[PDB]
Every structure is written in structure tokens, then in C-alpha cells.
Inverse folding.
RNA sequence: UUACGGCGGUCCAUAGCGGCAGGGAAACGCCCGGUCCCAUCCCGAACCCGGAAGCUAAGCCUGCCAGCGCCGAUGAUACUACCCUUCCGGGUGGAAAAGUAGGACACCGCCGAACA
RNA sequence: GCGGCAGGACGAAAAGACCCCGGGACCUUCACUACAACUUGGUAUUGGUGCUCGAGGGCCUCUAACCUCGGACCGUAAUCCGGUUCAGGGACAGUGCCUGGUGGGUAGUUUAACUGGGGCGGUUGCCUCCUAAAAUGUAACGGAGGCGCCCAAAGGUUCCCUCAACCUGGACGGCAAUCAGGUGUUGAGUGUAAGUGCACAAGGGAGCUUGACUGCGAGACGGACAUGUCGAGCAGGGACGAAAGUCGGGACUAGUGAUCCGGCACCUCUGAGUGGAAGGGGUGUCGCUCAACGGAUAAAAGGUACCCCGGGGAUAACAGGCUGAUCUUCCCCAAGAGUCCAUAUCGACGGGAUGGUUUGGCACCUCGAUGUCGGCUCGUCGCAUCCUGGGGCUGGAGCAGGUCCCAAGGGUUGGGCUGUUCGCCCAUUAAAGCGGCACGCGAGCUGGGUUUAGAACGUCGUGAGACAGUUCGGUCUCU
RNA sequence: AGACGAUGUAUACGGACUGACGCCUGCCCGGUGCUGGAAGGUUAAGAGGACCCGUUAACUGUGAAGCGGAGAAUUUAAGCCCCAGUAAACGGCGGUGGUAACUAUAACCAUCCUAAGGUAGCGAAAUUCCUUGUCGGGUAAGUUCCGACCUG
RNA sequence: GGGUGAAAGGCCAAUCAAACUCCGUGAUAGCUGGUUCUCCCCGAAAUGCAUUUAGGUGCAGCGUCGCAUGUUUCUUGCCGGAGGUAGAGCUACUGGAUGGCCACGUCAGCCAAACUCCGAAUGCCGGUAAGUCCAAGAGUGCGGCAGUGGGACGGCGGGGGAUAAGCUCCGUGCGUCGAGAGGGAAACAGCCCAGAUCGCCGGCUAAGGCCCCUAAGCGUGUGCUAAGUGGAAAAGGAUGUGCAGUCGUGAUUGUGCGCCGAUAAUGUAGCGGGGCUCAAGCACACCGCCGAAGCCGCGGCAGCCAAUUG
RNA sequence: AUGGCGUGCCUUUUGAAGAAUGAGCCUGCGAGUCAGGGACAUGUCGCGAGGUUAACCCGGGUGGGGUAGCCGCAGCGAAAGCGAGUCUGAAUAGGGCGUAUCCACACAAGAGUGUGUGGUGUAGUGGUGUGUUCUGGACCCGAAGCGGAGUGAUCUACCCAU
RNA sequence: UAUAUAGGCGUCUGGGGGGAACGCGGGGAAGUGAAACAUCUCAGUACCCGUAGGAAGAGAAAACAAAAUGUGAUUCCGUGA
């Protein structure tokens, strides 16, 4: 005679899908992130979901700018 | 209540959208774009 | 080249915020007015346009200050992967946070300014 | 080997009847869906005049259809059945077809799962945090909260702006209205939970607008699958902006429902001889608390102690097993009360263990059977000793006690009431001890209790029926 | 068809409950039934068929005649709606809050509620959970028994 | 689905909440049982998701066979990454919270799954250099045939319970059993050691052992223990005793063994028995040997691979 | 004589010597089958851009005919349709599904390699073996019960005549 | 009761029952499958009733087909599938 709780939502895989030096195609997705933890640098867009994705092909960085954490592709 | 209103052309019901009976009476005329190929005014 | 004015770069304070004294050559400034282009939920305050009377008193700039804030080892310890241990405990690698020694009043890059 | 006794071989007998699971069967009703039966009208059988309400209905009368289980007569030397004929009724009844209603009187069925056994309770899909152990993912009837929307701007784009709190000075006006001016770097604010973000603003203002578009989409994320999720970029034709540019709804993630079959508009796609149409098909979109939310049907509740069959120790009741919260016997520390004096005797608050004897937790053995409380018969062991026996201390004069240590040899009565165990009482006694052994012992016994079928009472139920509520009756197998 | 009922006829026959005899059998017509009444409301078949739609002689896209698809209004009957009767029909029968001249109790009275609030009689009962109620009798000792009380 | 019934669901040919017999019919059962010859090679799962579903089943996961591809797989060292747990910290926020000084403020000492200025180790993802390489009998794609979808206990990190359970539900390129015999633990699926092709009256070892049962030490050296401690247990109580500290005796602190507390029911019965202190006990040293189906030796079979032999 | 070591078999289970199930014993019988131009994989054999016949008729027979048909050979699309293309679309815009495949050359340069000229030139189908599968009782045994047509009152329930 | 019937009387011919399967006509289940269950399936099957004949039914277009196009009663088999 208890438990008013005992519900949960589906997990939604939500994590950095591309780490470090990886070769990543032009439209290829990376860090899904709810609420833009990471911000878009030079060759990454940001979707309406706050999902980041590559614009150009190249190699993923993870640097920073002005205190913010930045993802960006540099070319090969 | 938020009912389901179809938008019709002056010439020529491509679309339908939610608007309400209380806040927006005299149901809406806006504008919007296939048969003609221009943005023609559409009324409720 | 010298206390000049812009526009930047740094896994953005060792660049900050204060304190005390200096700066005005061109320039940045406040300033001087509201006709002209353009403005205020009201006001030429601001946003604009038109000028150069009066000054560095402020911004901006350059000094010297550990005053707050920041940065921060080395060496220990906690924790820990793996191993060995009959409870307890230790063995070979990783290794903080905290506090301490001290750092620090930034450091660079190409475009002008008047003097070359 | 023979005679005996029955403690065990979880003895023999009966694929447990209890319990749950899924198949059946009867029963019940305001479950569902038919049907019988009963009644209602239309219309055939079914006709003739009359009088009227009418925008074909209501009725009158008549006899000829049709009826009589009214009589007489004949076939016929019989209360059947025909035929004839008087007397009645009469286009009504009955009967066919069509059709509304009533309808457990019958018939076929349905009546969910999870679940520390089942029932009652709670829950069922989606979003958010923690459990979750620094990628992702992750259980429980673990711990917290939300959603089934709202907004024609709370969307798009171009500009500009910085909050809350706090101190100081002001008519009404105060620790809250507005007014200035200071400190103030994120506390405030974000349509909506929480988290992640956001001061460069995604927060606060204003001007114009409708991209809350049409045809598309390289490439990845995520997944059993079905879903779902992001998307640069190209074109048409537009919005804002001087431009570069951004715009395919909203800071982000909840706000939804697959298929099937229908509804509407649109398109020259087809059109069963041909030319048209009907119907089909396409593009666009509408109808599901299908919420038990991957939806078994368009359409569905209960009882069974009258039960039946198939299974299970995958799962309960009895006993064993582990555990020991709760019970039980000791113990640590003494605040104290005992005239004074903690420890003669009691000992609060708090702490630590023993025992497995109570109520429990768990589900490990047995459901192709481990058969049942109390009593009788027969016992056997332990000591935490009721009596007898031996000791220390005493707030022990003596008698009689108290308390603690030692000790298991023997002994521990008969009746009253209750099925009782326990308990209250009675008269005694040196004393009327406490426990274990399937709460010892039914192939040793009884059958009062519990727990089958009968039946009445109170209660709950529309009802069948139900109740660790009472009541009376109720097969005890084996060489 | 016919049969029993019955070779009976309301002092008879069928059904429902109750159960010799004695004294009795209170209140409720809201619900559900059953009985009657029908003035209106709603409605099925069958009649009726305006207005539409398909085709084509005629008119060059415009439409009447034939044929046939869709079929609205207007018409009714019983039922249900509605109004009454009926409880020896199935059933149903209340709540709290105050008050007496010592205490206690509440004749009484206030206020809600319903269709109406349980009357007579009985009561710890085949009915009473707490329960071995309390009190008396019976017994050396009565969880049963008998007689009372009423907190049914 | 009818009869009869002074009514119990009674009785209707020993059977009745719907008789019996034959035929539909070899009814159906997600249920229980049974399925018969041999050797060889390989070898699972007891999880995820969905379910009028939970003891059934569909697809994925894990097995096998055949055809592709030919090291990609796995391992270790480097390197480039994101993380918010352990720990810690809090005038760094959000709560809870102790004591001073004057509610606040200041001065200290704190606590936290749903607190974070901070912040590991491990694991994870990629790139790279070798290793393994007559082998893992790998990895990935496609197909034929599967079974499984009741797991259990141990180690470590958790939830629920009382931080109870041989409890229950999870995580872990965690193990074993399931499906693994052998040796050790007296006996003893899950613990330690180790993977059984067959034969041998051959050696060397593992865990664990060496007085006798019982194969091998009454082994050696320096100490401790008097309680059969060893061969069960607590909060506590106490001039038992050995060493190392600290102001001939008293206090004091550490530390090795030991004493009491200690106490359930058939019979010693809490060393596996005997027996052990003349240590067969305990601690650290030190030589040996015993001990497996492991390893080696000699010999015989078979499978895959590359040159009958390896 | 004696010594060491050693807890039946099967089923079903997390786990069985189990005190869980099943069998007293022996001999004989008793469970994966067969039909179909069936379906998909896969051997093997005939013929190959073709392969093969079904009813049926002539035969002493298993051997001759028999081209109707089915499969391959062109697709894409809702369809009309057009066809190495085609469909959605305003589109020499992309994308979907096809053009047997593997080669060189050309261009493009690229966002993961595309488009073309040129060569090469495909492999199905009908028997039969095995695996599994569809429809049939489909590996074998076992309910309680459901429906149809009959058989029962010599037992028992009740009534009728005597 | 009379035109006559109903009946009565005398006479000739036929029918009545049985059978294994096949035939045609009419009535017509359920278990089962749908992993429940009503539509649907099982199935026009089991079973029942009538009535045959060596065979029986059907049968001589109020039929198909789609025009540059025709075939020519019915039944049965293969294929369309
Ligand atoms: Mg004997
Ligand atoms: Mg037995
Ligand atoms: Mg059974
Ligand atoms: Mg029924
Ligand atoms: Mg259940
Ligand atoms: Mg439960
Ligand atoms: Mg992890
Ligand atoms: Mg994670
Ligand atoms: Mg104020
Ligand atoms: Mg036509
Ligand atoms: Mg579901
Ligand atoms: Mg379902
Ligand atoms: Mg049974
Ligand atoms: Mg038990
Ligand atoms: Mg037992
Ligand atoms: Mg069990
Ligand atoms: Mg047995
Ligand atoms: Mg004693
Ligand atoms: Mg007993
Ligand atoms: Mg007995
Ligand atoms: Mg016995
Ligand atoms: Mg009895
Ligand atoms: Mg009642
Ligand atoms: Mg009797
Ligand atoms: Mg009575
Ligand atoms: Mg017309
Ligand atoms: Mg009964
Ligand atoms: Mg009988
Ligand atoms: Mg029946
Ligand atoms: Mg192997
Ligand atoms: Mg499978
Ligand atoms: Mg911590
Ligand atoms: Mg399952
Ligand atoms: Mg499972
Ligand atoms: Mg598990
Ligand atoms: Mg584990
Ligand atoms: Mg654990
Ligand atoms: Mg367990
Ligand atoms: Mg020896
Ligand atoms: Mg010696
Ligand atoms: Mg020795
Ligand atoms: Mg001992
Ligand atoms: Mg003793
Ligand atoms: Mg040796
Ligand atoms: Mg078991
Ligand atoms: Mg198994
Ligand atoms: Mg056995
Ligand atoms: Mg035995
Ligand atoms: Mg048994
Ligand atoms: Mg036998
Ligand atoms: Mg047996
Ligand atoms: Mg039968
Ligand atoms: Mg008789
Ligand atoms: Mg079925
Ligand atoms: Mg079934």
C-alpha cells in the first residue's frame, strides 16, 4: 500500500558520438546534447534540437573559446 | 477550444492549422503559397 | 623610437577589481548648438546630423602598490586498477582535493598617428 | 528362523480434493449478441351501400368470402371426420409475407496482466532528475515530479536594452505601487515539471511581417522490428535587412494512437461491346480515454462448498531449513529509590549478546498426497530447579523469608467450567517446574474443534451466492 | 391438429408466498414491477413522392420529354415519455447539537434530511463482535444452563 | 436440457450440475509423459524488445555448416579526446547544522544519492607501432538448420530489508558450476588448484600436506603460549605474561599470545578420530620430500593446416 | 582370505544417491511417415539462350508421340504510358528502382568517387538425393467435455388399472 | 336433396420390402481453426429424409465473345491459377 511514484522516460542516447581525431563525413553528426553544453565552432552547424553536426569534412578538435567549450572540424 | 481550420484560395484546401474560437474570432486571413505558383491571400 | 589611436589571437583574470600618483603633440574624448538626414512608449539625455568655444576634471592611457580575486608546484595522504592475503592487511603502477613554497599589477600579431 | 509391538523405510492405497495456473461445465443477472414465445401496425385472404374527419383516415350497418367444441340430419348395422341444412358471428378474427416493441423463457460466449502465493489495494503510454558505479545502456510494487496542452504572437527577421535583491532621498504611500542614483556579473527572468543551458543573451522592449511555405535532400544518430531524430545544400516564389545573411514554427526534450474501413475536396489516371456515367485509384487531409495507450471483436459482467479434467513444490496452508525484527533468558553502565548508604532488594535512560519456545520475513525439500488441533496410551532427553539435598550475602534475633551460586537421583495430585491449548476457581500437597523431540506419538486409539455435501439466523449482494461471523447434523482404509 | 385442466364452471380451477390454534399484523407509492388511462411528445414497415443526379432527340455549350439512381417533407400503431392505483408486489424504515431547583439521566426542544424514518411485542437471542457483558438461582468449584437488565 | 421430484440437485439399470451407446473422431490440450544403433569434429543460452503476455511465442543476442572478404578481430606500449562517480570541498551555489562574539555580520568545527569552485584510477571511442600469426581455429557481410528465452553461488560496486536471510532485484572482456571428470577443503554442483584423445607396475610439480589412521619431517634455528588456548562469539571485567616506550620500587602508553563473560534439548559431538605442551600449537626464518587424468618421457589413434613426415 | 577407491538408471531441474517422478522380471509388439508439376536452400545429372511438356492417344512395359501451358529472356510506374530507361517534379535539379559483372580510356576534382565511348560478354531450366517448410491425424500416447442419430422406467421417482 | 356428388358394390392392373458404393433433389450440425470469440471457418462435411438407374444428372442457346472477330448443345479431364 505505497508507491505514488515508479515512472521513467526512455533514455535517449545522448552523448558525444564522435571523439577526438576522427575522419567524419560532411553531414556526419556529433555530440547530440540537450541544451547546448558544447558550442559550434568554425565547421559545425547547430540544429533546432541543440544537436551539433559537421558542415565540412575533416578532423574533430574539442578546443575552447572565451571560456566556452567548442567543437570544430579542421580540414585534412 | 482549438479547432482545425482549412485554408482556401480566392481562385482554385492545401493546408489546415490550429487557431481558436475565443481569442481569434472572425477567422483568420493570412497569405501563403502550388497550382498558381504565387503567394495568394488565404482566408479561413 | 617614445605614457599615441584602431582591429584582433590565447583550452581567456598569472590579463580581473581596487589604491595612490602622472598624461595630452596628431588622435580618442568629453564638450558647443538643433535648421538640414534621422530619433524618444516623455525629453537633441541617448540615437543622429552640424561645428571647435573651453579643458584633461572624468573615460582612455602609463607608472608604482599584494589591498581583495586569481594562478600554483614539490612532498605526503585519501581514493583506486591489477595482484597477493582464511576475516585483518599489505605488493607494483596511477594519483587528487585541501593547505604550503612561491608566482603575478599580463603576454603577443599588422594596420595607422605625429616625429625618422 | 519363530512369536509379538508399530518408531522409521518422508510405509501401501488414490497422476492432491487444499492453493495457484488454463481448459471445461452448470448456475445467475439492469454483461454482450441472437432466438422462441407474446403483443403492435401494414398488406394478401377481403366484399356491398351508408355517414363523416379530411389534404386517403374515422366509423355505420348488410351477407356472399371465412369462422362455430351451436343443434338436427345423412355416409353409418361412431362424442372421430366429411357433406347437407337451420341458428349465430362476419369482412373482424385466424393464417402467409413485411415490421416496431417486450423478452435469462432458452442458446452460444466473454469477464486482462503485473504481483516477494492469490484476493483487496495500487499500476499500465509519453517527458525529466536520482538510483546508474565520470561514454552509451541498465532492474525493483526503489526515491521525486509532470503531460493528453496553450500562443495569429509566446512564430519569422532587423534593431536597441540589462535584471533581482540592497542602501539613500521624496504628497497620498507603509521592509511591498511609481520617482530619481548609487553598489550590484547573475542570484532575477524563461507560456508549462525537472535537468541541461542561456547575461555574447535563448531574458526585456519596439518597426515591418506570415518560412507555423511548395518540390527535394548528400550524409550521419538511434534502434529486434515498426516507429522516431538531426540535416548542410539545390530550385521555385516570398518576408525582414543598406548589405552579408538568417527564416521549412516556438532555448531544448512531454502535448500523442499503427493497420483496416469510411468522410470531404482535388487530378483527364482507369471506365469489363462502344461513347458517357457508376464504382475504383492517386495527391491533400478528417473520424479512435483503440488510456489495459505495438491497439486480440464493430459488439461482453458475475457465481460454484455441486464441481470436473490437465499441470505445478515454477506458488500458498501443516512440518523441516536459514534469518532473529518481534518474543525469550542473562549481561554492560548506574540516574536513582532504599532514614544515611547505587550494587540486602529494586533499578530508569542507553548499550551488548544467548536461545529458536511466540508473532513474523524468506520460498530451499515434498502437490503421480510429508493426512488433520486438543485428549488418551507410551514415553525419552535438556536444565534456564517447582519440591527434597549442599552453600555465600542479608536492611538474616528466633520462626518464616528474600536474593544469588551448585546440583537433573527421584518425585511433580484429583475435580469444576470450556472442543480446547492457555486461563479462572475448588480441596489438598514436601511440590503442584519450564521446554525440545513433524507445536513427540491416528499402518497406536478417540473425532469434541477445524475444513465437503443438508439446513436456519444475523449481515453484505439486483441475483447465483459470500463471511478465521454463530448454529444443529455429518463413512477414520491396510493380513 | 389434439390432449390434460374437466366428462369441472368462480363455494370452481391455476399460480405466488405464509404455515394448527390464540392475540395481532404498524409507517413508506420515491426506485423497480404489476394494473388502468391515453390528451399530447418521439418512432418502424407500408404509403407518399417537391427538389436533385445520370443518359440523349432537340439547340453550340443550353435543357425539356422517355428510361432509373438517389430519395426529403407530410402520414400513423403498440412501447417508452406522462398522470394515477397497488406493499399478505419486489423492496425500504434517519442525523448530530443543548436542557431539571447537589450529581446523573433527558419529558422536553432546536436544526438538518428523506418516499418514510422501526409501532406493538421481544431482546447478550439458532441473531451480541468487544464477551467468560453485569446481576440473581443452581454447584465444594458453572466460558454451558435457567430468570432478569438493555449499552440491539 | 427431457422426465419424475411431500424439494436433496435427489433419482432415471452398482456411474447424474444433464444417463447410456454408436458415429462425427485418430476432437482439441501454450499441459505432463515417451521417442529405439555407433564413432568423429565443433559447441550455446537462461539476456534485450514486444505480447489478452509472463512456465508460450516473434525478431535481435550467443552456436553450427557452406560461400564470400583476407587481419579488420583480440592484446600491449605510445598518442588525441569527451566525462562529473570515488575522494574531497563548501563567506563557490543549494539546503541541513554546532559553539563563541554581537537577526544579519564576523570568528571557528562540520554534513549531503536527487549540493558542486573542484576532481581521479579504471573503462569507453579513434589513430598508430609491433606482437599473436603451419593460429585465435579470430572479425565482418549474406544464406541453410538451430536451441535458448525458469539460472545458481562466490568476488567487487549498489538499491529494497533491520544495512536480517542459503533473501530479493541490478552492474562487472568478474570467475566457476550449469555442460568439467581429476586433486584439496573429513563428507560437501558454485571455494582453492587444474581443463580428462588412449595406453605405461616411469619422472618433476600445483593447491594442500608430512606423530599413527595416511603417501611424505617426532626436520633445523631463535622466541612466545599453560588456557587442550590451538580446536566458535560480543559490549565489558581483570596484579596472567613476553617485548618496545615514558617520570630497587610504585604509577603510566604501545604491542604478541592468553583469562573470564560462555549458555538446549537421541551420545563424547565446536581438532576428521587416536593422541599431542618431552610440543603433533603460534610467529617469523630455513632446507627437504609427498601430492593431479596438470607438465615431461616412450608408444598408438584421430581433426585442421603446410611440406608420407612435421 | 584381505587391502585401496567407490552414493543405482531414466525423466525433469539453479541443483537429484536422493526421502522428486517412472519401471517386480523376461520375451515379443510400440513413436519423425507418405501424398502434391507444392515452397525455399542445397548436392548430382541431361540440355543450354533456351529448358520442359499436362491431360490424352498408339503400344505386351518402364517405350514413342502430344506445344496447350509454366519458368527464363526488360523495366519503371497507382495507372494511361513510355522503354535502357522510367517515376515524383516547373526542372539537362536531386533522389527512388533497373541497366549481368569485372577491366582500360576520356572528362570532372569534388563532399567519399561520378558520367560516358570501347572491349568482355552473362544462365537459366527439367529430373532425382538430402535439409526444412505449407495443407492434410503429420513424431507417438492422454482429458473433462461439445454436436448428431438412436437405446433405456425388469433398478429407482411418480401416476393409471386390477 | 333434387340437378348430382360423397360413398357403396363388382372387376382387371400396379404399388408395399431388401441391397456395398456411385446418382440427383431437399433439410443440415458441432468439436475444430481464428493462439480468446459472436461475423467467418470446419462445411454444404458428418447425419437424416425422399427417390433412382446401370450408370445418373445436364443437354440442342432468351449461350459466350468484343468488332479490322469470331466460335457454335451438354458432360468430364489438363491448363488458365
Ligand atoms: Mg519377527
Ligand atoms: Mg505414501
Ligand atoms: Mg496433480
Ligand atoms: Mg446464460
Ligand atoms: Mg495472475
Ligand atoms: Mg502478495
Ligand atoms: Mg560506467
Ligand atoms: Mg552513464
Ligand atoms: Mg518601503
Ligand atoms: Mg462503357
Ligand atoms: Mg502494451
Ligand atoms: Mg494485444
Ligand atoms: Mg486434479
Ligand atoms: Mg513453513
Ligand atoms: Mg520434510
Ligand atoms: Mg520451492
Ligand atoms: Mg510417491
Ligand atoms: Mg544450574
Ligand atoms: Mg504433534
Ligand atoms: Mg485415524
Ligand atoms: Mg505414525
Ligand atoms: Mg465434529
Ligand atoms: Mg437483499
Ligand atoms: Mg444423528
Ligand atoms: Mg415457511
Ligand atoms: Mg431528364
Ligand atoms: Mg445446494
Ligand atoms: Mg444410479
Ligand atoms: Mg452438458
Ligand atoms: Mg571444444
Ligand atoms: Mg528464435
Ligand atoms: Mg563522497
Ligand atoms: Mg518468457
Ligand atoms: Mg527472465
Ligand atoms: Mg540474473
Ligand atoms: Mg554477482
Ligand atoms: Mg554483494
Ligand atoms: Mg539467491
Ligand atoms: Mg607416513
Ligand atoms: Mg623434536
Ligand atoms: Mg616439529
Ligand atoms: Mg577449543
Ligand atoms: Mg550449567
Ligand atoms: Mg618431488
Ligand atoms: Mg525445484
Ligand atoms: Mg538444464
Ligand atoms: Mg526414487
Ligand atoms: Mg530410497
Ligand atoms: Mg511424491
Ligand atoms: Mg514391468
Ligand atoms: Mg513404483
Ligand atoms: Mg454425448
Ligand atoms: Mg415401473
Ligand atoms: Mg479457437
Ligand atoms: Mg487454442
Amino acid at each position: 500500500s505505497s508507491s505514488r511514484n515508479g515512472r521513467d522516460s526512455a533514455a535517449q542516447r545522448l552523448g558525444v558520438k564522435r571523439f577526438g581525431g576522427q575522419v567524419v563525413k560532411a553531414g556526419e553528426i556529433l555530440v547530440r546534447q540537450r541544451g547546448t553544453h558544447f558550442h559550434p565552432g568554425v565547421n559545425v552547424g547547430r540544429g533546432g534540437d541543440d544537436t551539433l553536426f559537421a558542415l565540412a569534412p575533416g578532423a574533430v578538435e574539442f578546443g575552447a573559446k572565451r571560456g566556452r567549450k567548442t567543437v570544430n572540424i579542421v580540414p585534412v | 477550444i482549438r479547432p482545425i481550420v482549412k485554408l482556401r484560395s480566392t481562385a482554385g484546401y492545401t493546408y489546415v492549422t490550429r487557431k481558436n474560437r475565443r481569442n481569434d474570432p472572425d477567422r483568420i486571413v493570412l497569405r501563403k503559397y502550388p497550382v498558381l505558383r504565387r503567394h495568394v491571400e488565404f482566408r479561413e
